[PDB]
Design a protein around this nucleic acid. Structure first.
Lengths: 108, 79, 94, 95, 94, 108, 96, 79
DNA sequence: CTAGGATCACAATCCCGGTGCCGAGGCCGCTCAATTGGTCGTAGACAGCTCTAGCACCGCTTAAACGCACGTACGGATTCCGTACGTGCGTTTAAGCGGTGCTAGAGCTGTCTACGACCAATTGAGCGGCCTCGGCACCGGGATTGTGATCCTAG
DNA sequence: CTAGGATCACAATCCCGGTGCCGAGGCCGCTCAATTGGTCGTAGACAGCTCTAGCACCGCTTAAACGCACGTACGGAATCCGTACGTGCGTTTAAGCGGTGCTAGAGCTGTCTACGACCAATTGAGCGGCCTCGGCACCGGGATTGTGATCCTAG
């Protein structure tokens, strides 16, 4: 009898699907061959980024006394961080609105 | 004249989200023109995508793609 | 009918790791799926370009690392590379 | 009681900058979209989510443009946006 | 000795067709090579995306045509499509 | 004895290399398969664009009493045509310079 | 003797430099700057002559474009003198 | 002190190609800063490409690629 | 006596002619990459069916748009000042060019091994469908913040 | 009697407790895509070698940067006018919502065939290398354009 199936995600201690990432790379017309480490690395990077943005959005929600993340919270989190703003510069978050910003010259 | 459906108070609301305090009377026509140009461009690319797929219904994915290729990536509608 | 794959399950796992008592709306889940797909494409495409420029046929962890350095700004890259490296190490030791 | 010009304008700025709802009426926008699309291909149908996506993109674009138009006005020592500010903003943006 | 392929011969042929008495500098030839490579990778990339969106594995003349319509502005696309169509027709009749 | 080799460029009445374009498409990680008409179409489009640019540059050279095209002539040809300028908007032509343009308000 | 009014030589220079295509930054100083900047990323770095030339071409194109947008901003504020606030505005609107 | 090598008359020449007639005295430092930022960005990406190839010499192709990915495509240096 | 056009002195730029040099255009050898001929198989074209989701219409109910009016404050024109930037000249400096010398490293070739593609069997992870219940939006009504002006006083 | 601050009116916003609804999260069945184990071929890592071009240095010429003097025109502040955008009340209109009905076409499935990949052979087009000559850059002189200002003129 063979060994119990152990997912590549679990071997790497990741939540993101390594097998799926591998398939998407192989079938995405990117290269002829795909190394064994490429899906692991990519999955880890995508998991880190989503953890970061979820953490910041949850913080914004908590600051707004809310328990569910909505697009507004995602926009607040993204626009208030210089690095995430620079990464997501040309991205429009649906139902995100804008940051409260009034020019100092307009105040009474 | 469906371009006139974009009313004076709609444009004022858009300007107020943009932080504009005072608006000249000539801004409304300029804005209408700008919007028309933008819309034409996006719709023309979305329809091109639709026609390539041999479909008769513009899908949200056609729009998303059109925006993407113009450097105006939209999040929330499947990509 | 039929399957449309998405990253919902994995987004929800990560959210439960970082905020156990915080949920997420369907519209936010759609935003997070679009985000994950977009970043995936950006990274894979730059790894592909890197490979092609150097007349190589294989995308390895090195190509991914370089793409991450090129795409992610500032400290994001620093931490992302660290995360990726740790994962690869753990994976290589099963 | 009559509020001095500017008070209500700032109150509206705060209100719309705090909210996230779409500000253009749906039915007129849909009509505009369909009218524009008519020139490219006849008997086109439209998914509800296609129209919503278009509206979202258009509104975001216009808000961004109004922001850049406002910066131009402030730089010319004005507080009123004029067509010449939109034109300048667009020219510099590359449009 | 390392051979580096380029479009020089074909750019010169076309020049001699449109302007028999006009030559070209090496720097202009480099500009025309860069141009031809850039437009090639724009068109091919768009055709690839189109194919992928429709879950197709083959890039055909239809994908190229659509990619031309999407990339080339105004009358450029009108004439380019005509040119492409003529060539295919001529090619199909040997 | 087989038949004399006939190039796919000559069969299509093209100056651009159909065979080369085909090879570049197959080995460029664009798709799994490449249709027979794709290289022909692409080559024809490339040829048309090249002809257009070269024609406009030769005209500029002839207007400048020159017999050889230089980067300057290419820049002039591209920036003086709205459509070619739009296509090559975000492109820098080395040693091309700029179009003579002085704001009317600055004139004496 | 003869003195040209302010503006005459400035317009003559505009016409001359807009008609010519040569590089306007001295090569040796630019090379030194490039090497100094690259030093912070990796040590003992060599540079192809064509790498430095490419950098200088890109930089000069970028700066010319920026000066054009700075000039438009100035003209819009009813000035003829470009000032730091015009560069800043141009860059902000450009997204830089 | 190599940023100072970009002298006042060089900046004036660049402005004159850009059609600028009058130049404030404070423009030179601003321009120097802008150029520094631009250069840093491009060189950073070019060096990243160089390091990935395990080379010790920055090639013109590294620069071309760096410019390309920043939306400043350069024609004339092999792509 | 002026505003205006005419005339003038002068520097800068366009134009014509001769010289020369080095880059462009052509010829030659060869080699490798493109063409000819054939086979195999699977991807896409075409026909048929389902049911979903788009389109069209109708009736109330307000919410929002349109219009008009009174007024204040913001855009814009005019004037004056002083200083900061343009123009020009003499001095200094370092860029540009040529020539030489050296060696680090880019580029290529050959061997071989580890690593990635591929296939067959297995199975458990992930997707569709159903359901429940609690987080949220909404409402009424008080407490609070803020704008505007009326009142009071020392000055 | 005036300026400034104190005080007042009261409109808009925020906060709180109560309602209830429909979307998010969890559970179950299934199916297909990920895993395991083994085979095989070739892509790239590593070693070694060559030869090119990048770096360092020196001398000489001269063009460009620099510093300073002078003047003028342009940015900026101040004042005044007036019109035209803002705030608000009243009337109108059509957006929004809920419901009903029809049907077009999007999505899926089954079958087949033809179009593209792969292989072997072969051959000619294109690339490296060498070589010559003429097109353009430069220098010199001259004709012209243009700026700045002095002059004569009609009024």
């Amino acid at each position: 009898a063979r060994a119990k199936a152990k997912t590549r995600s679990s071997r790497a201690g990741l939540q993101f699907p390594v097998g799926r990432v591998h398939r998407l790379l192989r079938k995405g017309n990117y290269s002829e061959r795909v190394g064994a480490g490429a899906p692991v690395y990519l999955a880890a990077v995508l998991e880190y980024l989503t953890a970061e943005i979820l953490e910041l959005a949850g913080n914004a929600a908590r600051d707004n006394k809310k328990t569910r993340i909505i697009p507004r919270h995602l926009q607040l989190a993204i626009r208030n961080d210089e690095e995430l703003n620079k990464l997501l510069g040309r991205v429009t978050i649906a139902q995100g609105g804008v940051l409260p910003n009034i020019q100092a010259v307009l105040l009474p | 004249d469906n371009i006139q459906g974009i009313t004076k108070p709609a444009i004022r609301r858009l300007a107020r989200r943009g932080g504009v305090k005072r608006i000249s009377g000539l801004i409304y026509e300029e804005t209408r023109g700008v919007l028309k140009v933008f819309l034409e461009n996006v719709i023309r690319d979305a329809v091109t995508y639709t026609e390539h797929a041999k479909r008769k219904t513009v899908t949200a994915m056609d729009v998303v793609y059109a925006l993407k290729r113009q450097g105006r990536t939209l999040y929330g509608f499947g990509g | 009918r039929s399957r449309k794959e998405s990253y919902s399950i994995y987004v929800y796992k990560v959210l439960k790791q970082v905020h156990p008592d915080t949920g997420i709306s369907s519209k936010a889940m759609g935003i997070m799926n679009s985000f994950v797909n977009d970043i995936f494409e950006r990274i894979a495409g730059e790894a592909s370009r890197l490979a092609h420029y150097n007349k190589r046929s294989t995308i390895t962890s090195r190509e991914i690392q370089t793409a991450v350095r090129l795409l992610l700004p500032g400290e994001l890259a620093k931490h992302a590379v660290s995360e990726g490296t740790k994962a690869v190490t753990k994976y290589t030791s099963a | 009681h009559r509020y001095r010009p500017g008070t209500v304008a700032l109150r509206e700025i705060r209100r719309y900058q705090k909210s996230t709802e779409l500000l253009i009426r749906k039915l007129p926008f849909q009509r505009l979209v369909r009218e524009i699309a008519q020139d490219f291909k006849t008997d086109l149908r439209f998914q509800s989510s296609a129209v919503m996506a278009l509206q979202e993109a258009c509104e975001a674009y216009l808000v961004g443009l109004f922001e850049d138009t406002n910066l131009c006005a402030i730089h010319a020592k004005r507080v009123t946006i004029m067509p010449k500010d939109i034109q300048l903003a667009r020219r510099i943006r590359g449009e």
